[PDB]
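Usage example:
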Amino acid sequence: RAACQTRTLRFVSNVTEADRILLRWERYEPLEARDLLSFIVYYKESPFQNATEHVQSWNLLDVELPLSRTQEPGVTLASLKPWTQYAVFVRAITLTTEEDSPHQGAQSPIVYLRTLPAAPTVPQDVISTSNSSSHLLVRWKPPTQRNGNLTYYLVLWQRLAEDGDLYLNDYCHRGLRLPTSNNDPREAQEASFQKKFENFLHNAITIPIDFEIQEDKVPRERAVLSGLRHFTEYRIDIHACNHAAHTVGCSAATFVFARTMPHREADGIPGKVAWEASSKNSVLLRWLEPPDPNGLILKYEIKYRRLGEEATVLCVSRLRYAKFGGVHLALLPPGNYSARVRATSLAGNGSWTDSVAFYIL
Amino acid sequence: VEVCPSLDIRSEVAELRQLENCSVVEGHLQILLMFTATGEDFRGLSFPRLTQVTDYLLLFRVYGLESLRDLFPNLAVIRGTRLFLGYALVIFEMPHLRDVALPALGAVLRGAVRVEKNQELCHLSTIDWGLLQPAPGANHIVGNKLGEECADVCPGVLGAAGEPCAKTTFSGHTDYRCWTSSHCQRVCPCPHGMACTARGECCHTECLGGCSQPEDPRACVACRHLYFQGACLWACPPGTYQYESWRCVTAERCASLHSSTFGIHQGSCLAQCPSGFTRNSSSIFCHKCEGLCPKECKVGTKTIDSIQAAQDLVGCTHVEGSLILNLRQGYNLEPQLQHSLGLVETITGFLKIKHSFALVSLGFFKNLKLIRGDAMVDGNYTLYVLDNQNLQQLGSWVAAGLTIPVGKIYFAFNPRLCLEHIYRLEEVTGTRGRQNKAEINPRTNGD
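Running the assembly step on the lines above writes:
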């Protein structure tokens, strides 16, 4: 019926795409008469260059040869993962009803074709921590789909300015929860939501080209960022890359937000606290703001007390402090008074300064 | 004032320029994936003319954008005719975003709100969604900045920007309601869904979002029920019909808007008539179907290789083209292929079946009645069954049901197809002498 002496079919043209493979081979016209034949193409994903024909594991594909003199048969394999090796070979069928006629089957050598690479998947499991006030340590995992030969990771970190609402407020009333640095130890609708927002990112590419983005390239799956400001938040974008100068580019970012450790003594008050009393029992105390605090200064707490009795505290906002450059203390019994001042920043409480002593008569 | 169909914007702030003259988006507005965007590009960009989005609003990874208070300073109503998985407003993974800030937002007619994974975004507990949505319990607002980690400063409260505004109750909390530190939410005394103005007196009932004069339908900024000729109406005038669930159009206008499958059943000019109704060429109104919808499907030469490749034809009755079945790797495909193919009643072109090793029988063409043969296989063939290793029944679309006007048939290499079935097909087709030997001849089919 079939499977007679076997001929050889040569591939005349191969085209590789990101997820397609176009193939052509010479037109094997049968040594026959008003008969019929067609080809069947076997292709399977084989990482290595060892594979066995005829056998399932393979994926079959029928191709009827066109009825003309030009346009060699050709096929277009589709839905192929990028940067994968595929073993392909074609085989003629040439089923005939002739009584006495050679069958003369034909097939082709197994040929391995590699499809073009594309941008890889976003990095997975990005974690970050701070070991000091000017360093950030970042770790992650390789992308799920490398889509090529992994070469490096593009790391970008951008400084984040504090929101303006902290600047205008009175934090003596309605206090808020202060932020902290980083100390990480370095359902159908939900699935559809994540699937849609992953298909959104599948078409996203990145060209490997108070706010200033600075670039870095890292070979391993870990990075250290140095020279940062103290107690300032940073946004970190991490893209996986491969041969991407001509490819569609690098991956999409996997940004995380990390804050550096507070500076230990950035909230200290410079110089010494001066004063200038008034004849109406009211006294005025002056002190200059810290130049570079941890984020910003929320309030000033001043502790004053008469010589001998208990202590009294007073909270002052930025607005009240800046309205006159200091603090007024009125309606007090005459005597010798001692005062200490502290600054409160986003990191937390500051350090008490030296005592200032004055008199009221 | 402007049509402005649904628009997706990506990858460039320049692409955001297609809303210059837009007034009402008759669709969904998407802004996403703007990696190379800074806080300077979005500072000088504003679209004050946009005042309504019919479908929904989505924002996804727009870098540099800090607030929507400048992008859409006059956006008022989100109709929510269709939803992004039930959400009319989605804001996801937005770096640098600090507040939602839609200061002119009047209502979200239908759909929930999803504001997730914006690490720098707060001012979300200072807004009551009860004065915006009718069912605020479906909102999904998690993953943002910690609620107690930022000061949701409203223009009133403590020493702030200035004049305060009213406070309501949303989830058992009586606190100030505000959008940003300067703009704060708008309320006014009258029953729900009654838009008001600067004077505080709320406008006509049909108004929505806002107005300019009270108790004047022509002065509304957004029509609650229907819109026509700069006025808000409970229903369209008798000479017009609804369109996109939001405006009134004449018959010829909505006929031109879809230029063949449109219909005006139940006073609503849709794009495809619903189930149970259809129209072909008469006056455009989806009258009730007799017993089934004669869906017509046009394909050039639809090669079929699997059930998934055949699910396209689901529900088709008249096929304008040819079918080329080739099912080799399947197993017991008859019940699966009956659902897809089997409502077909006429094939204008040819029918070919090659190398179908998985097809035990051709019984999934039960309603097939005619194969005219307009598209005709080379060699003067219309029915071309070739190389079917196990094909026994050849279906039941026989006994005077079948009719092939032109073109011959061709059966070859069907060992298990007994010649009795082929000869019965020849008899019921009414054309037996059309073919000749070696086209049906044994030693190939019928062993």
